[PDB]
């Protein structure tokens, strides 16, 4: 890939339906790229799904294609947000807004 200052291989998801956990994310992302790692973010005290996830791909092409196919796509009844993210910078902003701010998993501003 040529667009980033570093390779763009990691996707941040937000507003995931709380049934979309590690196995689902792997099952659905592997249709769009080679998946290396999946992580869902949980509330620090309740351990509940924040609707946030990280998916790391083998190539930048897999990450771009996942974003193209899944951004603004409805998956078990919720519209997903999916974008390339460097070092979880946007992911951790969403984490703070839900966990320590007034927002919820389905209302976090992206």
Curated annotation (Swiss-Prot):
Residues of the signal peptide: none
| Compartments where located | Nucleus speckle; Chromosome; Cytoplasm
Every RRM domain range? 4-87
Family, per entry: Belongs to the class V-like SAM-binding methyltransferase superfamily.
Question: Subunit arrangement?
Answer: Component of the SET1A/COMPASS complex composed of the catalytic subunit SETD1A, WDR5, WDR82, RBBP5, ASH2L/ASH2, CXXC1/CFP1, HCFC1 and DPY30 homotrimer. Forms a core complex with the evolutionary conserved subcomplex WRAD composed of WDR5, RBBP5, ASH2L/ASH2 and DPY30 subunits; WRAD differentially stimulates the methyltransferase activity. Interacts with BOD1L1 (via COMPASS-Shg1 domain) at replication forks. Interacts with HCFC1. Interacts with ASH2/ASH2L. Interacts with CXXC1/CFP1. Interacts with RBBP5. Interacts (via N-terminal region) with WDR82; the interaction is direct.
Q: Which clinical disorder is mentioned?
A: Epilepsy, early-onset, 2, with or without developmental delay: An autosomal dominant neurologic disorder characterized by early onset of generalized tonic-clonic seizures associated with sharp wave and sharp slow wave discharges on EEG. Some EPEO2 patients have normal psychomotor development and normal brain imaging, whereas others may show developmental delay associated with abnormalities on brain imaging.
Q: According to its record, what is known about the domains?
A: The RRM domain confers RNA binding activity.
Q: What does this protein do?
A: Histone methyltransferase that catalyzes methyl group transfer from S-adenosyl-L-methionine to the epsilon-amino group of 'Lys-4' of histone H3 (H3K4) via a non-processive mechanism. Part of chromatin remodeling machinery, forms H3K4me1, H3K4me2 and H3K4me3 methylation marks at active chromatin sites where transcription and DNA repair take place. Responsible for H3K4me3 enriched promoters and transcriptional programming of inner mass stem cells and neuron progenitors during embryogenesis. Required for H3K4me1 mark at stalled replication forks.
Its name, as the record gives it, is Histone-lysine N-methyltransferase SETD1A
Record organism:
Homo sapiens (Human)
Lineage start: Eukaryota, Metazoa, Chordata, Craniata, Vertebrata
Q: Which gene encodes it?
A: SETD1A
Which residues of the full-length protein are shown here?
A: 89 to 195 of 1707
């Amino acid at each position: 890939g040529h667009m980033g200052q570093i390779p763009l291989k990691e996707v941040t998801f937000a507003r995931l339906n709380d049934n979309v956990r590690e196995t689902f994310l792997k099952d659905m992302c592997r249709k769009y790229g080679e998946v290396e790692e999946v992580e869902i973010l949980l509330h620090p005290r309740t351990r509940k799904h924040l609707g946030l996830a990280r998916v790391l791909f083998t190539s930048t092409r897999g990450a771009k294609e996942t974003v193209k196919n899944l951004h603004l796509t409805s998956v078990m009844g919720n519209i997903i947000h999916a974008q390339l993210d460097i070092k979880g910078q946007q992911r951790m902003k969403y984490y703070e807004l839900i966990v320590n701010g007034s927002y919820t998993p389905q209302t976090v501003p992206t």
